[PDB]
Symmetry: C2
Subunit: 237 residues, 2 copies
Amino acid sequence: CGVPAIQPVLIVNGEEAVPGSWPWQVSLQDKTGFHFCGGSLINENWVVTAAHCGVTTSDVVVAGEFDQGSSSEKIQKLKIAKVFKNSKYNSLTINNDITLLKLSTAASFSQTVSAVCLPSASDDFAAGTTCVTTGWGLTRYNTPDRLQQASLPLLSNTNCKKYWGTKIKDAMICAGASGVSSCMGDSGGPLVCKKNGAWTLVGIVSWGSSTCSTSTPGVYARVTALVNWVQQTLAAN
Amino acid sequence: CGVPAIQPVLIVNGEEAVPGSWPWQVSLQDKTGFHFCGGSLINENWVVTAAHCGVTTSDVVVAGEFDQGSSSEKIQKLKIAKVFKNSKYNSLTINNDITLLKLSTAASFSQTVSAVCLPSASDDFAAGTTCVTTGWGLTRYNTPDRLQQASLPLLSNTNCKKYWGTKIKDAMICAGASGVSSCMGDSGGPLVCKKNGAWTLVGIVSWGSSTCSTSTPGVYARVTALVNWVQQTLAAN
C-alpha cells in the first residue's frame, strides 16, 4: 500500500493534483451523481470515510476520477454492500468520526486506483510534520471539477485546544492553520503522511471552520485511535 | 393523525414535556444505545428524520420513551428495514434535509405512540405563528434524560436571511430567535404547528447556531417542500 504508480507532485488554497496521483481517493456520490464526500480505499473491498458523511447502500463509491466533469476517464462506480459506522461515533461531538464501506463488488486495482496504508495504533505522528489532504470540496467558501491537494502541518491536541477548546478529543487530530483549509465536500477524505516512501492515512477529513478559515486548524479523525476497530471490522466481514 | 391521546401542556430554555404527550417523537439510537437524533412517526411503518442524521440499518428507532434513563417505560425498539435519503439532499448546504425510515416491523400504536400529520405542499405556515419543537438534545451547550419541548415562532425566509444570508434555501424554514434553541441531539426531530385541533409537521430539526444561541434563528427542513417526495416514497414502498 501507499505507493502511487503515478507519483504525486506537490480545499481552499490548494492546487490541482497530477491526475491519478492519489489512487486511494474515491468520491461518495448520491443517486443523482452529486459528490458529497471523499473516501479512501484500504483494499479492493473496503473504503474508509467519515461517519458524518452519512453514507447508505443507495450511495455509490466512485474510483479513478480526477475530473468529475469529464466523461473520458476510465472510472469505477462501485455499489456498497454495507455501511459499518464505528459504534464509538458520537455525532453530537463529531468524535470517532469513521465509517467503513464494504463494496458489493471489488475494485479493480490499477495505476489510478490503489490502497493507502493504515498505521499501527501505537504510531507517532509528530506535531510539525507535513502531510497532504486531497478532495473535491469547495475551493472558496465554488466547487472544483478536478481533484485538489494541499500540504499542511500536524498540530498537537494541546495547541489545537487553543482554538477549539473542549471540542478536541483524543480521537481527533488537528491539521492546517497554515494558509490552506479542508472545506465542505472534503469530508471523509484522506489526510496522508509520507514515510519510508509510502503514504499512511493519519486522518479522515472531519470538521473545521464554519467558513473554511485558512488560519484555523482543520480537525480530522485520528486514524491511530480507530485503526483497531478498522482491523476488527475487516477481520469479521 | 396529530391528536395526542395524552394532551401536551405548554433544547435550550425548554421545559420538560408531559410524559407521552408527543407520541410521534422517536429517538434514533446507535448499537450502543446512544441517542444521536430525533424522528417523527408518520404511520406505523415509517419514520421521518433529517438526512444529516446519517441513519443506517444498524441504528434503531425507539418509540414511547419519555425518560431515556428509565427502565420502567413500555417502549418499542424497532429495527429499520431501509433508509430513504431524499436524492435532493445536499449535505454541503444542508438543503432538503430529510430521510424516511421504513421499519422492519410495524410500530404498535398506543396512547404513547402515534403519528404526526403531514401538510399539503401548498399549505401556508405564516411568519409569527407559534409552533413547538421537541427532543432530547442538549439543554446547555448537558444532556437530558427526559423529553423537552419549547414553543417558538416561525420566521419568514427573508427575515431569516438577515442572520444567515445565502445559507437559507427554499427548502428551509426558520424558527426561534425567541429565547429558546434546538441543540445537538435535537436534529431529525419535529417542529409541529397546531391547527383545526391537530399537530402538523412543518419542520424537521436541521441546523442552527454553532453554540445553540437563543437569539439566533433555528433552521428546519421545510416539510411543505418535501412532502411530495415523502408521499412518492411511501407510495412506492
